[PDB]
């Protein structure tokens, strides 16, 4: 008489591709408290869907055709199109909510909207800003996935999104995930430059991008002392897919993909869960709060002010 409610096999659609709410996740929610919400953000081919799938209910040794979050297929890469649309939803058995996100400012959505405001160009930017603000106001942590280092345009977008957010202020933690890392990026000399650039580029961001999720203490660098870094921000690197002398494998210079994925998952799960509103909330209450926030963000006033400026 204490069996679990149900087990989710595949992620559902929390928000339709037309920016419409979809109330269909209450069937898998309970009345428990102390819930954790994780969101993702990134460009078109960064790999947010794969990261979310591997961090929620998947393993690297499994296949990409059975992932909880649909990933880009080989036939789709040749056409230069996107796969994830709208916002997804999935909750693991540990009562951890995972939220996916479509690419921001991606040319695929723009091209699809061409054959369908003053011009059909600021619409994509506003949709991206709306999603960023929503994830920044109803999620406990947000992970930013970057295909390459220093895009120089994501920081400005993040600051602008946080400046136009809906609303003793609450600022969720920010995580910088560098996907498809190489050996050259796994050196202390380059690490210092990376941390310095990240810290100097977000000096007045008001977000919690430091003091938590320190990969230096996760045994990634055995002999690297903590004082070697002026300010270790929350940055993590994810590498590319992976008689006796002649059988020695090649030298990669970076830890195994599975090891880093497991470490990242453990660190994400062992994170804090601060309060969102000025009251305690449960799973159902959190769902209702998120729905109300999305409804308010859609018919907001700051967005119109920013729209007349473009």
């Amino acid at each position: 008489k204490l069996l679990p409610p149900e087990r989710m096999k595949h992620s559902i659609k929390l928000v339709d591709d037309q920016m419409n709410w979809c109330d269909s996740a209450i069937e898998y929610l309970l009345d428990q408290t102390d819930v954790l919400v994780v969101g993702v953000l990134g460009l078109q081919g960064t790999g947010k869907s794969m990261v979310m799938s591997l961090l929620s209910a998947n393993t690297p040794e499994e296949d990409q055709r059975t992932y909880v979050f649909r990933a880009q297929s080989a036939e789709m890469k040749e056409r230069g199109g996107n796969q994830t649309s709208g916002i997804d939803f999935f909750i693991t058995q540990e009562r951890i909510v995972f939220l996916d996100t479509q690419p921001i400012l991606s040319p695929s959505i723009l091209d699809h909207l061409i054959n369908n405001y003053n011009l059909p160009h600021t619409y994509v930017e506003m949709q991206s800003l709306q999603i960023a603000a929503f994830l920044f106001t109803v999620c406990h942590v947000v992970i930013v996935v970057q295909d390459w280092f220093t895009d120089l345009s994501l920081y400005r977008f993040l600051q602008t999104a946080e400046m136009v957010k809906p609303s003793t202020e609450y600022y969720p933690h920010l995580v910088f995930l560098q996907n498809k890392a190489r050996r050259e990026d796994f050196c202390p000399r380059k690490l210092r430059q990376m941390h310095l650039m990240i810290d100097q580029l977000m000096a007045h961001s008001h977000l919690r991008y430091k003091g938590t999720l320190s990969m230096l203490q996760c045994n990634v660098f055995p002999g690297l002392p903590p004082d070697f870094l002026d300010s270790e921000v929350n940055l993590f690197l994810v590498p590319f897919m992976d008689p006796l002398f002649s059988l020695l494998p090649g030298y990669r210079g970076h830890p195994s993909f599975q090891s880093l994925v497991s470490k990242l998952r453990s660190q994400v799960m062992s994170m804090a869960r601060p309060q969102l509103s000025h009251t305690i909330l449960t799973e159902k209450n959190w769902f209702h709060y998120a729905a109300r926030i999305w409804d308010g963000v859609r018919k907001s006033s700051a967005l119109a002010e920013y729209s007349r400026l473009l």
Partner: peptide, 18 residues
């Protein structure tokens, strides 16, 4: 030692096994 890399540790283990 306790400050070895994954590649270095793997190579050392292979040599030790041989």
């Amino acid at each position: 030692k306790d400050n070895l890399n994954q590649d270095t540790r793997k190579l050392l283990m292979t040599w030790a096994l041989e």
